[PDB]
Structures are given as structure tokens and as C-alpha cells.
Design an enzyme around this catalytic site. Structure first.
Site, PDB file in Angstrom:
ATOM      1  N   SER A 213      -0.852   6.477   1.213  1.00 33.05           N
ATOM      2  CA  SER A 213      -2.150   5.884   1.480  1.00 33.05           C
ATOM      3  C   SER A 213      -2.180   5.440   2.914  1.00 33.05           C
ATOM      4  O   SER A 213      -1.147   5.443   3.592  1.00 33.05           O
ATOM      5  CB  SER A 213      -2.350   4.665   0.595  1.00 33.05           C
TER       6      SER A 213
ATOM      7  N   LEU B 193       0.884  -1.168   0.000  1.00 36.06           N
ATOM      8  CA  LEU B 193       0.000   0.000   0.000  1.00 36.06           C
ATOM      9  C   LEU B 193       0.907   1.199   0.000  1.00 36.06           C
ATOM     10  O   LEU B 193       1.828   1.211   0.801  1.00 36.06           O
ATOM     11  CB  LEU B 193      -0.805  -0.028   1.288  1.00 36.06           C
ATOM     12  N   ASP B 194       0.644   2.191  -0.872  1.00 32.36           N
ATOM     13  CA  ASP B 194       1.541   3.331  -1.040  1.00 32.36           C
ATOM     14  C   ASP B 194       1.782   4.094   0.273  1.00 32.36           C
ATOM     15  O   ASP B 194       0.927   4.123   1.162  1.00 32.36           O
ATOM     16  CB  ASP B 194       1.053   4.299  -2.144  1.00 32.36           C
ATOM     17  N   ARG B 195       2.950   4.723   0.364  1.00 33.86           N
ATOM     18  CA  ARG B 195       3.357   5.482   1.528  1.00 33.86           C
ATOM     19  C   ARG B 195       2.311   6.516   1.924  1.00 33.86           C
ATOM     20  O   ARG B 195       2.035   6.678   3.123  1.00 33.86           O
ATOM     21  CB  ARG B 195       4.675   6.183   1.252  1.00 33.86           C
TER      22      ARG B 195
END
Length: 179
Positions: free
Chosen positions: A46, A42-44
Site C-alpha cells: 500500500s 500500512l501494508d508494504r
């Protein structure tokens, strides 16, 4: 070791990894479980559900490209999406990497279980709304790209559920072992 599956409610600005990265926050400060890594990073920037496992066969199954796994997001956007924009997200838009599959998209109240971002969202002239978005694909930054495409850029992105797993009862920065 038996198969361990850990659910984590990832804070904003934390990388979805245990490996040290100079200048960045990572999972070791939050999670004492060893030998686990993300089944779906999961993106930083997000927030929300990160599924971690120690079982490479399980991780391969869960992350299989093309799988069509359901993912539910709560998305804070600038403005109030019109009915036509929501219809477009539901039916499909064409991004630079091609048309999107049909999706769920609904304008919702800010859920009371929501936590504030640290630091808080940076006002006055621009109202904000919350959307519940359900996707069945996972292209690079897709939700952000989709909401921008219809004229309502994302301010916060929270992943609530991924396949069989969800954030139910998991506070920000907290983890739980399911199996």
C-alpha cells in the site's frame, strides 16, 4: 520528550517500521525522527498516510480495535465498476470474515496530485478506474478484498486520510511533524 506526531506519505514496497528487515526497505532511510512507530501500520504494497508517534498512550487510543475510525482511500482498480458494484460497496458485502459495514464509494477522476508508482503499473486490453473509498473498519486487506469481491480487483491502494490526519501537501516519501 514531548509527544511527537509525524505524518509520512509511504512509498510502495516500504515496510511501515524502523526495525531493520533483511531484503526489505524500511523507514530509517526516509525519516530521521527517533523513537517513533506506526499508529496503524500500512501494508508494504500500500501507499500513503502513515501516522507515527513516540507516545504509547496515543498509539493505543488511535489503534483501539473496534474504534470506527474513518479512513479514506484512493484505489486504482481493473475495469470500470458499474453502478450496481458501487452500490454494493456502499451498502455492504459478505467477506469470508463476515458482512462489511456501510462505506463510501465513488468513481473519481485520477487526482492530479497523484504520483506514479515506482515501478509503474504493469495493459491495452484492460482499462483502469480510480475509486474514492471511505471505510470505518480495518480488517486484514479489507479494501482489496472488497473490490475483488464485486469483480474489480485493486491495482494500487493509497491511504489518504485516517481520523484527524491526511496527506494534504505531503509528497511521496516526505514526512511532516504536526505536534
Amino acid at each position: 520528550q514531548p509527544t511527537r506526531v509525524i505524518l509520512f506519505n509511504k512509498p510502495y514496497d516500504v515496510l511501515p517500521q524502523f526495525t531493520d528487515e533483511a531484503g526489505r526497505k524500511t523507514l530509517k532511510e526516509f525519516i530521521p525522527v527517533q523513537g517513533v512507530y506506526a499508529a496503524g501500520r500500512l501494508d508494504r504494497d500500500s501507499e500513503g498516510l502513515l501516522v507515527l508517534t513516540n507516545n504509547g498512550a496515543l498509539q493505543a487510543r488511535l489503534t483501539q480495535p473496534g474504534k470506527r475510525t474513518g479512513k479514506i482511500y484512493y484505489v486504482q482498480v481493473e475495469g470500470i465498476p458499474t453502478q450496481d458494484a458501487l452500490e454494493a460497496l456502499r451498502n455492504g458485502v459478505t467477506l469470508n470474515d463476515g458482512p462489511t459495514l456501510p462505506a463510501g464509494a465513488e468513481l473519481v477522476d485520477e487526482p492530479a496530485w497523484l504520483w506514479p508508482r515506482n515501478p509503474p503499473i504493469r495493459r491495452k486490453s484492460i482499462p483502469t478506474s480510480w475509486l474514492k473509498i471511505t471505510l470505518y473498519e480495518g480488517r486484514n486487506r479489507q479494501v482489496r478484498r472488497m473490490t475483488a469481491h464485486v469483480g474489480f480487483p485493486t491495482l494500487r491502494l493509497i491511504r489518504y486520510a485516517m481520523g484527524d490526519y491526511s496527506l494534504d501537501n505531503l509528497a511521496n516519501g516526505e514526512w511532516r511533524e504536526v505536534t
